[PDB]
């Protein structure tokens, strides 16, 4: 599944709805491995629409339980991420992913 | 057939990425992307075409150089580099 551990609390009231755009910053790394991506480096926040299957399942379920302002460590098992195939060139088969995700804003 | 260059690229990138990442079909991904680039090559003929070419022309031309690099190298890392520039375009259009 996806485990959500809080780094800094959000407001505890404003949670994403299906169909809303979540605006986030993230850093991704392989569990006890390499950092492979960060929107912070790029100075540009990542946006995705919750519930449209644009992103991996662990993000869909993980971000849905976060409130605005929250920063959390998401640990995502391979079956909630890229599974036995991985993501070619970047994520190997059967990788556990850890993301640091900060929910900035909803649009 | 009347369609804005914004639309033809959003739909074309979406479809080409499905063939390549979803289906592992590189031939089908080229087939989709080659006519899109060939229209940029011909040049903008409307104000809306011109402003799309001003904002995204250089990125799309660079994504095409990476794809052409891949044609000659056989190294899939060259095609990923093209998809990073295609996705930045796609997100900006979106």
């Amino acid at each position: 599944g996806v485990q959500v551990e809080t780094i800094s609390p959000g407001d505890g009231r404003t949670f994403p709805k299906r169909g809303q755009t979540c605006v986030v910053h993230y850093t991704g790394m392989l569990e006890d491995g390499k950092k492979f991506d960060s929107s912070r480096d790029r100075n540009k926040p990542f946006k995705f629409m919750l519930g449209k299957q644009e992103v991996i399942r662990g993000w869909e379920e993980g971000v849905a339980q976060m409130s605005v302002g929250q920063r959390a460590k998401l640990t995502i098992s391979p079956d909630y991420a890229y599974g036995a195939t991985g993501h070619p060139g970047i994520i190997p088969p059967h990788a556990t992913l850890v993301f640091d995700v900060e929910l900035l804003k909803l649009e | 057939v009347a369609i804005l260059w914004h639309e033809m690229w959003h739909e074309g990138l979406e479809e080409a990425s499905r063939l390549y990442f979803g289906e592992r079909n590189v031939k089908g991904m080229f087939e989709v992307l080659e006519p899109l680039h060939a229209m940029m090559e011909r040049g903008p003929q409307t104000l809306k075409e011109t402003s799309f070419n001003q904002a995204y022309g250089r990125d799309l031309m660079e994504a095409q150089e990476w794809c052409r690099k891949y044609m000659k190298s056989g190294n899939v890392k060259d095609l990923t580099q093209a998809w990073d520039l295609y996705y930045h375009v796609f997100r900006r259009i979106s």
Side-chain angles (χ1 to χ4, degrees):
Chain A
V2 57
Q3 184 183 344
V4 179
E5 290 176 271
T6 295
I7 298 164
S8 323
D11 72 359
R13 294 217 168 258
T14 315
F15 290 87
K17 189 191 171 169
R18 231 71 62 199
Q20 287 192 281
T21 298
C22 304
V23 191
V24 302
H25 263 311
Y26 74 90
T27 296
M29 70 185 250
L30 300 175
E31 187 157 74
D32 298 321
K34 209 164 177 182
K35 168 200 174 280
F36 59 76
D37 194 19
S38 178
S39 61
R40 291 177 183 273
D41 291 341
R42 280 197 291 285
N43 306 300
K44 189 187 172 179
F46 172 81
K47 303 187 188 183
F48 73 103
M49 208 180 293
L50 189 76
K52 305 299 264 188
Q53 289 183 314
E54 298 183 352
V55 291
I56 60 175
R57 186 175 180 180
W59 267 60
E60 294 276 62
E61 286 176 24
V63 176
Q65 55 190 278
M66 288 175 74
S67 57
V68 177
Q70 189 174 341
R71 185 169 173 182
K73 175 197 161 104
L74 276 62
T75 306
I76 301 168
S77 55
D79 64 306
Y80 272 53
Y82 298 101
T85 133
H87 183 70
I90 308 173
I91 304 302
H94 195 251
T96 298
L97 306 184
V98 323
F99 287 87
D100 170 355
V101 181
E102 185 183 7
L103 180 54
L104 303 170
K105 170 179 188 174
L106 294 177
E107 305 173 347
Chain B
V1 157
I3 184 175
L4 288 187
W5 274 9
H6 322 64
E7 301 184 16
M8 177 185 294
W9 278 111
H10 182 280
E11 214 173 282
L13 291 179
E14 186 163 43
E15 180 51 19
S17 89
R18 196 212 78 198
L19 291 171
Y20 175 50
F21 293 110
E23 297 169 31
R24 271 69 167 196
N25 181 3
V26 178
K27 162 168 170 304
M29 182 193 81
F30 286 150
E31 304 176 13
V32 173
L33 289 172
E34 174 174 49
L36 300 169
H37 287 284
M39 176 211 83
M40 322 291 294
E41 157 191 5
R42 334 254 90 277
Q45 308 195 313
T46 64
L47 293 170
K48 283 187 186 72
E49 287 168 4
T50 289
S51 62
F52 177 100
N53 185 238
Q54 290 171 336
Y56 310 115
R58 199 219 247 275
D59 290 337
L60 286 170
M61 293 190 11
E62 192 185 346
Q64 164 186 264
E65 305 162 41
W66 287 104
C67 284
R68 301 181 177 316
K69 289 175 194 154
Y70 172 70
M71 298 180 159
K72 275 167 190 226
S73 78
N75 177 181
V76 58
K77 259 43 233 92
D78 288 332
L79 182 62
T80 50
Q81 268 305 119
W83 277 98
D84 174 60
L85 287 164
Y86 287 136
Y87 184 37
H88 180 52
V89 174
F90 183 78
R91 279 184 82 72
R92 283 191 263 160
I93 296 164
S94 290

